[PDB]
């Protein structure tokens, strides 16, 4: 994973996102959704999804939420106050903690001012607590700004490492982007049965055709403009959509 003071930032883009494999995986110790309850994720579409990744203590997972305070949310990783995405977290004691102490996971514990939301700060200047200038050397009131979790496998829960992923769905002003998977089903020809052909919603009896579209045309229309033929997306055969039976 990535440190907590330099989190990663992956920009998921146009694809087919299935948040159900996430939501029901039961391997996650924390799955909170804020802008939008979890079950309705596989039914919406946005412009961009960002995924941020890092590693923290066990009991600092409660500062990854909109409107918190503490050494993590103050100056390591700040979430805006109208967040939209979801926060996922799971314990990872066996991967990240090693006997003798894993001193490779640092965090920032001193900064001049709290972060703006989604702002990032990887500098390593000597912090200056008191009024006396520091001149790049340590000493009283001149502190190195990064500390390291020394993770060890015999730590009580709440001191073992947790891995965190923060999904943030954003909607700029584009034309569209990633959305959840669609559905499907078989085709029953010859029987006034409701139908949906990748967008075309209708009712009627479906029958094998003998017309020939051009190999880029989806459906056919009549004079007076009513849909009367379609092409099945999967098998690519033309079927006449005669209106249902009435009189």
């Amino acid at each position, epitope marked *: 994973f990535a440190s907590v003071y330099a989190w990663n930032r992956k920009r998921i883009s146009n694809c087919v996102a299935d948040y159900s494999v996430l939501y029901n995986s039961a391997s996650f110790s924390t799955f909170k959704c804020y802008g939008v309850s979890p079950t309705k994720l596989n039914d919406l579409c946005f412009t961009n999804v960002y995924a941020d990744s890092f590693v923290i203590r066990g009991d600092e997972v409660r500062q990854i939420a909109p409107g918190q305070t503490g050494k993590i949310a103050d100056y390591n990783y700040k979430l805006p106050d109208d967040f939209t995405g979801c926060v996922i977290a799971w314990n990872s004691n066996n991967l990240d903690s090693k006997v003798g102490g894993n001193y490779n996971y640092l965090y920032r*514990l001193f900064r001049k001012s709290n972060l703006k939301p989604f702002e990032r700060d990887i500098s390593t200047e000597i912090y200056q607590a008191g009024s006396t200038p520091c001149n790049g050397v340590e000493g009283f009131n001149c502190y190195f700004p990064l500390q390291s979790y020394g993770f060890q496998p015999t730590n009580g829960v709440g001191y073992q490492p947790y891995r965190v992923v923060v999904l943030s769905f954003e909607l700029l002003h584009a034309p569209a982007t990633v959305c959840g998977p669609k559905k499907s089903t078989n085709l029953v020809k010859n029987k006034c049965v409701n139908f949906n052909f990748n967008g075309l919603t209708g009712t009627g009896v479906l029958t094998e055709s003998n017309k020939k579209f051009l190999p880029f045309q989806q459906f056919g229309r009549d004079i007076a403009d009513t849909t009367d033929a379609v092409r099945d997306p999967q098998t690519l055969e033309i079927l006449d959509i005669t209106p249902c039976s009435f009189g």
Partner: antibody
Amino acid sequence: TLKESGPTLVKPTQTLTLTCTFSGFSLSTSGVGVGWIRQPPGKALEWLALIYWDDDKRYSPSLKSRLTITKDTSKNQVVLTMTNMDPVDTATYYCAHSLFLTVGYSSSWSPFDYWGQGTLVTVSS
Amino acid sequence: DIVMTQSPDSLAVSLGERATINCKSSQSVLYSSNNKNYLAWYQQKPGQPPKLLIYWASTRESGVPDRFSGSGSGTDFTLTISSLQAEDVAVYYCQQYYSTPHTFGQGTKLEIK
């Protein structure tokens, strides 16, 4: 793992080096030091001198005139020379290993963390 | 200057029993930029130096029994030693770098009842 080596009975007014021989760590990386301490009997303790990783030396302002420290990362030691012996300095003389002064709101310098043992000093002719 | 006034002097605590030592800093010694107290508890064995028991007032040192544990708030600072063993005939100290001079606890007699 510190240990303060030195002579046991002293005579007045002369300069006196002092050796806190340690091991288990070095002494030149950002966040490390060793502070030197005395305590006369019945009194509370008195830290005397200190030196950090890039040799940031501290002393008590009272015997700033007489205390003179230097760290020995190579020997895993610290040399502190110290002048003007007097019988109210009848103390046992300690060293204590500093670590990450970010934690520094807990001890009044009196202690630290490591801490060796101490070489006794008595002022008698 | 923030004087550290101990709690129980000639403590006649029985064997295996909760021995209590309070430390009253005269001022609130909390560095509020930590959300965590600092205090260093110490154990002078007679003829021996005081050794660091609990730093951060909640993070016990290595090799130390967890039957000793630290507590305290604001200006009152207690020590939750749950059991007083036969090895505990010693002298104890509490202090703060959050000051200027060498403030001190005064030291307690640990008679084992």
